[model samples]
Target: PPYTIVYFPVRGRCEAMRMLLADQGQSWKEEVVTIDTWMQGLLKPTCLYGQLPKFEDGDLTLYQSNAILRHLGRSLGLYGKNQREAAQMDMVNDGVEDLRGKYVTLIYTNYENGKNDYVKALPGHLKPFETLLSQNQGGKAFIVGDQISFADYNLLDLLLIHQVLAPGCLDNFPLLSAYVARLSARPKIKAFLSSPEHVNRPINGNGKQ
Candidate 1:
């Protein structure tokens, strides 16, 4: 069955899921909610956590972006080869979410006040993922295993946005730099990223970061 995602037009939480769908060659519909519609509070009450990227596939409806990604990953076989690998993938995903949570706070809440500290401590935040890459397959492949997982898409989006927020942030981490290049070069991902649909949208709504 096809899927549908409802969220604001900005890339925010939905971009990774969109990239996952695109890279997996899956078709899904995007139901973008305008700010006016959002302020009406009609859909907010319907949301599980009163937030979007709400998603639906057949009779299975879900909220929470990470849940949606994991659901897609498990269903599409992008999870992992074995339980060990799946656990590793889950760990990697949690790490990504940790950094992403901090990032969202800085970008949306205290950008001007927190930008300096966030950028200064950015390496500390990113090093673990770099180490994860280095420890796995000698930094030659995906984040968790030989195969790509949904966590990879989430981590990729995180890295891309960080690079924009702090230019040359990945320069000190050669593995991460190359990893971004390699994943970004995948034919489907490359095309989707370059297409107007993805390129035209800002990462955030407030025009900062």
Candidate 2:
């Protein structure tokens, strides 16, 4: 295939791109990099950029996960058409990163303390997404425009993380909960999630905590 992606086999940082590729019906190879191998082959001085998840499209290669995702999204027509919508998409994606950072902090904390911290912290974090979904939709179907964009799927993936990890994270936010459900119900997303490749795993996929 012309498209190929490399990342931690676990859908941690690379999941958004994977889901986007999956939704686009692109048969891209996912080159999984284990920690040990990543250290030796990717992070070592000899590696081109000392990183895994380096995308290679023929003669062109790229580094940085978020940049790769943004590139892929734009290249595959997954991004919004105009500059304003594109900027909005970037903001949403960056917001996802911010949320992920909070989740990572919660994950690293002691379990007893983590639960309390997560519960306390999540409301503020989760509520904004719900509000964004409600406001962005503006009685329409998707996030930015009337059609699906990277922003929508990006939000969907983040919401899926919440659902899989925290279970009740969205319980209080009906609009966000409904938005997530709607995105999950999409045929492509549903099929991708149901596939063995996308199956949940403690060490790889969601529910790690």
Candidate 3:
């Protein structure tokens, strides 16, 4: 059965999941919900948290973007090679989420005034991931283990979007810059990113970020 993703047309929280699916060479379907449709119909009312990015795989229905990523990762054998690795994977994912939360706040709520500060402090925020990469196989491999995990997908999305928001943001971190290029060059991911399906969509709704 194909996985189904329900979210807005914008590539906000759902892009990572989509990228994961594509990179894994998995077949899936997208259920795009427009603002007009969401406000006019019962979709919003029926949403568990009155939010989007609801997902369906087989008979299982899921919410929460990270939860969905973890579920898919586990099923796809992309979580980790062992319990310890899985724990490290979770930690890495949490770190990505922490940075993503801050980026979201700045982009959606405080973009005009916060962008400068966010960019200025970006190094501090990105240093941990660089450290993680440095610690694991000397920054030439995936974030968690030698293999690509769901956290890698999430972190990749975060890096890509941040680069868009602040060009040359990763120049100071050679490892992260190379990491972005490395993962992005994967055949499936490279094609998907350049496809019109991804290129035509805006990253956010307000035309910022």
Candidate 4:
């Protein structure tokens, strides 16, 4: 069949993938699977690894989130043109993942505490990103050369999450804040975020629901 991305109805781990795919202007069905129904019918002939967020290309089925992204990045022009830039892009992606892990740990443990820590620590953590954007933009928008890349998308997700989860958090990092605003203003990114299927709605304040 054609490309179909299987994932739970909630955004969870698949939102980043969706953003990446959308950035490429690729059309794929967002098959939302419910945990209750998914567990009952998921173990069948189609799913090779028996997982969600699996990508199906023609008859070929692929699992794992990052693997699929890497494949798509290479296929699309989102990845870097040269080996050095590609390596740098990979490093940036990996760094985002690392920071995400820390973010998750803190948030899960204590959202308020995490929110505070994230705000305080973000300035330092985001400095390198601001520097990168300044160099990459070179007076023009977009990260990693003239066009958008995986690095830009990755950073966009992080910045958006920060802004949504902790409103007013972006004020400290002006460059990064501007970068996020630019990405949010993009027609595609704006549409994806404001679409009806968005899982995480923006909640004011850092307190939990």
- TM-score each candidate: 0.98, 0.86, 0.98, 0.81
TM-score between model 2 and native: 0.86
Model 3 residue 144 distance off true place after TM-score fit, in angstroms: 0.9
Between candidates 1 and 3, which one is better according to TM-score?
1
Candidate closest to the true structure, highest lDDT = 1
lDDT of 4 by residue, 1-209 (tens): 36588876655456776787776577888776666767687453466666667887777778877777777777777888789888878877787777766766666677765667666777677677767777865525765666677667777877777766667766866777777877878888788878776745322223342
Q: What lDDT does the true structure give each of the candidates?
A: 0.94, 0.72, 0.92, 0.70
Order candidates by TM-score, high to low: 1, 3, 2, 4
Score candidate 1 by lDDT. 0.94
lDDT of 2 by residue, 1-209 (tens): 37777766776667777777888888788777667676664355544677557787767777777777777777888788789888877887788788877776666555565776676777788776666667765524666666677677777877787776677878888887778777788788888888787675343333446
- Quote the lDDT for 38 in model 1: 98
lDDT of 1 by residue, 121-208 (tens): 9999889999999998888999999999999999999999998999999999999999999999999999899989899998998889
lDDT of 3 by residue, 1-209 (tens): 46999998999999998999999889899899899888887898788888888999999988899999999999999999999999999999999999999988998899999899889999899999998999978989999899999999999999999999999989999999999999999999998999898999999988898
TM-score preference between candidates 2 and 4, better one? 2
What is the lDDT, from 0 to 100, of the residue 61 in candidate 2? 78
lDDT of 2 at 175: 82
* Candidate 3 residue runs with Cα over 4 Å from true position: none
Off-target runs (Cα >4 Å) in candidate 2 are 39-43, 46-49, 108-112, 200-207
- Lowest-scoring 10 consecutive residues by lDDT in candidate 3? 41-50
Q: Which residue pairs does candidate 4 place in steric collision?
A: none
Q: Against the correct fold, how does model 3 do in TM-score?
A: 0.98
